[PDB]
Amino acid sequence: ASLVASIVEARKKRTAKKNITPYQRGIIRSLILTLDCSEAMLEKDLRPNRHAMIIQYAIDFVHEFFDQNPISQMGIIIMRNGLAQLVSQVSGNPQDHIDALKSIRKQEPKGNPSLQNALEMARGLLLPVPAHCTREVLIVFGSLSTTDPGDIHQTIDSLVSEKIRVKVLGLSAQVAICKELCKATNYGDESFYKILLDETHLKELFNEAVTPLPVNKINKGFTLVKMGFPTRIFEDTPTFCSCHSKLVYGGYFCPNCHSKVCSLPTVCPCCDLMLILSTHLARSYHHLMPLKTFAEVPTTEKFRSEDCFSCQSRFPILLTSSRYRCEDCKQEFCVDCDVFIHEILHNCPGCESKPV
């Protein structure tokens, strides 16, 4: 039963994974990461303290966010002494934000938190953002109280008017205003206010925010965005970069004004045209054609082959059949491959091999 207990839990874990529909997701994002640095963040419930762990996971989130959302941008704000302090402008450079977070890691948190000040600052940072982007604010909250100079309800109404979306990660318990902010802003959904229960669950919560948010059916901002695919040049003598005005050896040439840029993806400093590589778009294709989940095969029927289709690992004999099949191609897969086929790879090897 103990081994069966593992099986049934595995089936229950798979139950959630069974439902996968090709939701429309906003690939081009514009995130504002708000961190809480107040007296309440000096506690020791998270080792060594709340401030240290939050900053560390923020750096990891920055790495993951820009890895899977290459054509997005991020800005970082913190709450200190009842004021909102800006530490990073909206930009597509993942290194600027990590450097800012590392600097923040030293100073001791103190004072009171102010959601209204942070929300107002985030509202202003997302003003010069195109209409095709998804304006999002991810607040990491640790306090149980808010000291604001004005009416927070008016700010919430303004946020809803500007089509900004708020996700809040609380530390100890539910705050009434945070629930309202995450609900009135997400079209009534109450799943965007998450309260962790341990260190491990926090890492999952940060990891979940990396993926793009599905869009609402009545919020239509469909448009064609003018992009550019520059050609990398290899030069013999250094040349000035049009973005930082410093000598670098080689850089991509924009096809609209021929000015060179150090790194991609960025908006060209001259023609204001986004420069990206084809790979940066290919990094998001798995969010538009998600691979349909694999369902275990009951032992009543007869199996096809003794070994895995893609990895040639013989299935153990053991109660519970250790086989998962792809309905599209009907090829059995080992339990190990299916995790790697749906998290690292995003194409079923069986489907590709089949000719049409």
């Binding site: 090709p22 939701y23 429309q24 959904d189 109450e190 599905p214 869009v215 609402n216 059916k217 538009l288």
Partner: protein, 32 residues
């Protein structure tokens, strides 16, 4: 108006339903 909403029992009402839009990506294009 406002008082009525507070007196109502929210837990006994229908659960919130998501209204997310789906996209079906057809795949067909000319060769290079």
């Amino acid at each position: 108006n406002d008082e009525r909403n507070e007196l109502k029992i929210d837990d006994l009402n229908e659960s919130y339903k998501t209204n997310y839009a789906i996209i079906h990506l057809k795949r067909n294009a000319h060769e290079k």
